[PDB]
Amino acid sequence: MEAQPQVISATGVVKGIDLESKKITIHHDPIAAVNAPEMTMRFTITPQTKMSEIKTGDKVAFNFVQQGNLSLLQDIKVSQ
Ligand SMILES: [Cu+2]
């Protein structure tokens, strides 16, 4: 009936990286497109994610898709 956000773009700060469970915990800045406030959320690294080098405390720009309870990363990189 109308447009559905598929890819959500956001910025935030990395708070945890767990490469066993393939989970990056990010405290994201408000996200206008979805009317979200600041939130800490878990994002999933899949084999299709385009990863860049990141570490806890890095500000990042990232894009993800929601799949049920998962937020699957399309890409993530350090940002200004
Ligand atoms: Cu959120």
Curated annotation (Swiss-Prot):
GO terms for cellular component: outer membrane-bounded periplasmic space; periplasmic space. It comes from the Bacteria. Keywords: Copper, Metal-binding, Periplasm, Signal. One of its GO terms (molecular function) is transition metal ion binding. The keyword Metal-binding applies. It is found in: Periplasm. One of its GO terms (biological process) is copper ion export. Changing D18N: No change in copper resistance. Its main location: periplasm. Induction: Transcriptionally regulated by CusR in response to copper and silver ions. The cus system plays an important role in copper tolerance under anaerobic growth and, under extreme copper stress, in aerobic growth. Part of a cation efflux system that mediates resistance to copper and silver. Binds one copper per polypeptide. The cus efflux system is composed of CusA, CusB, CusC and CusF. Interacts with copper-exporting P-type ATPase CopA; when this protein is precharged with copper it binds very little CopA. This is Cation efflux system protein CusF.
